[PDB]
Every structure is written in structure tokens, then in C-alpha cells.
Amino acid sequence: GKPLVVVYGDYKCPYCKELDEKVMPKLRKNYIDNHKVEYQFVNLAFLGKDSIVGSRASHAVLMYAPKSFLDFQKQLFAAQQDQNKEWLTKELLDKHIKQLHLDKETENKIIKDYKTKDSKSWKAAEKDKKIAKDNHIKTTPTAFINGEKVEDPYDYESYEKLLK
Template identity: 35%
Template sequence: MKKKNNNQTFAISVFVGILLLLGALFYVSKVQDKKAEESYPTISGVNDVKVDGFNTKDQPTIGNKNAKIEVVEFGDYKCPICADWTRIVFPDIKSEYIDKGLISFSFINYPFIAKDSNLAALASEVVYSYDKDAFWKFQEEIYAKQEDETKTWATKEKLTELAKSVMPDLDEEKFKKDLYKKEAMSQVSSDVAIGNHYGVQGTPTVFVNGKATADPSLESIKAAIDAELNK
């Protein structure tokens, strides 16, 4: 009988221990989730945004803002194809159309690949708010230093380092704080809402005068631009 009681006591102890362990694991998981959310915030307020066109007056834009052709690219800084597009396709678009004043070209964030896509998008908005010209240099730098899309590499520290490389006088502590302020979040949520409204499914996606090109290839984009020029 004593042996049976000992077994029951042991069983109860094990059961209680398992419950305590599960509770501790749940708590740790919640703490980790909270820390991850603090470091890599989700983009909030997207459904509250009223979309009225691409709203390019608030977007990074180069070229002739009075041109009759408006080209818009949606991109994610974690997207390897976006990096290739910026390195291979964009220079031809710039030399053939932007530099000649034939089009305006705007970039809109559409982070969707991973949690640090959001932070990279927020960082680009902060850079843009500091120095509009530095935005394009920052974009080149972040794509040049892009790592494997399956890794969480767009950290607060790395993004600050990249911003510092294009803005040597950057106040690093202020930049880190501004990454999480509502101003940057509001702009990215607006960007995502615009992308959703126009049916963006991935990046890069390019629009010419409000119509998505067949694909982001140089040939498709040139065909769409030339068709508009010939109207």
C-alpha cells in the first residue's frame, strides 16, 4: 500500500512538473514573441488607409514630375529579384527615360517576404524623411548588402550602419528610435494599402500610368512606356 501511495505521489509530482514546464515554455515564448514584435513590428493601420491613386507626391520620385508618363515600382528590400532589377534593369530605364525627362519614376514599399522586410521598409522611410536624395543611395546600398532572403538580416543595427554609410552625419540613436515612430509606420501602411488596392502580388511589380506591366523585364517596361509616348 505504501508503495502504491509513493507511486501516486511520484505521478502527481511528474504531472505538476510537466505543467510548470509547459507554463514556463509558454511564458518564454510569449516574451520572445513580444521582443520580436518590438524589433520587427507588423505594419498596422493598412485597412484604415483610403487609397486615392499612387499618391506619388509623398513617394521617393526622380525624373520629370511633370512628365505625362508615371512609372511606379513596388519593392521589398529582402527580395533578391528586386536587387537584380535595380542593378540590371533600372540603369537602362534611367538612361533612356528618366535622364531624358520623359518619365517620372517613383518607388513604393511593399514588404511581404519576412518580418525584417517591414523594418527595412520603415528604415527607408526614415532615411527619406531625413534626406530625399540620400534615399536612393540608401536603396542602392541595402540591395548591395542584401543577404539570403531566408535569413533575418535587416536588423536595426545593420540598417543603421547602412544609413550611416550614406549619411555620415547621421544621429544613430535618433535613427533607431525613429524606426518605430508612427510617422514611418503611417507611410509604410499607406504604401502597403496602395499595393493591395492595385492588386500587387509580389515584387518587383511595375506600373506605367496606372497599369501593371506584363512582367518587370526591361522589354515589357519599355513597351509600356513607348506605347504611352506614342499616344
């Protein structure tokens, strides 16, 4: 089927922010939004206890407002602060969710889901950590297309080379 592009990272990871800024605009326009590839972001949530909270919020947005997911990612990475600060607070995340300007009830659904223990977004965030571990991912950010390593994960062309 369709090529699977996987990016391993963390919203607090500085380099992961660079990948988003340098690669996603073109990757999104040329392969993701036109449905030529599947895109999956696996959050290791390893840079502080707030990392996992941001991951839950992110997964909630993905499951309830998928068409707003990439904007959510871009805007969240853009707000990145010092990784030694637990800057991924519920206050900031709720604000970012409300910035998506979704219908009121969808917005409330997302907000409640990521704050609810064992919810689907809660489970998805935990699972991401298992995926990275089982896939033996030793550095972030790293990207793969159908399991093949992207030579330079910071260069859109490196992804293209693999996608044809």
C-alpha cells in the same frame, strides 16, 4: 503630367534585387534623375518581420535625403541575404544610412525617425502595404507606368517601350 513609374517589391525579395540590378541603372540615368518620370517604390514588406523595419528606414531616407534614395536602394539590395534570415536589423540599416555620408544631423534625423513609432516613415511603411493590397498586386516584383503593366519588369527596354 509626368509619367508615374511604380515598382512593387520588398528588399528581401530575391527577384526584386534582380530588377534593381538590371533596370534601375539605366532607368535612373535616362528617366528618373533627369526628372522625366516620377518613381515610386511600394514595399509589400511580406518576407519577414524585419522587412517592415527595412521599409521604414528606406522611407526615412526618401523623405529626408531624396537625392540619396536611389543609392540607398541599390546598396541595400546589394547586401541582401537569405530571405529566411531577419537580416534587416537596425544595426545593418544604421550602417547603410551612415554609408550615404550625409551631414551628421540629417543622418541622426533619419535614424531616429524610422525607429520612432507612428513617425512619418513609420506611417509610410504601413501605408505601402495598403497600397499594394488596394491595387490588387498578386506578385512581386511588378512595375507599372501610369497604371499600365510593364511587359518585362526586368528589362529596361520594356519600360522605354512605354515611355516612348
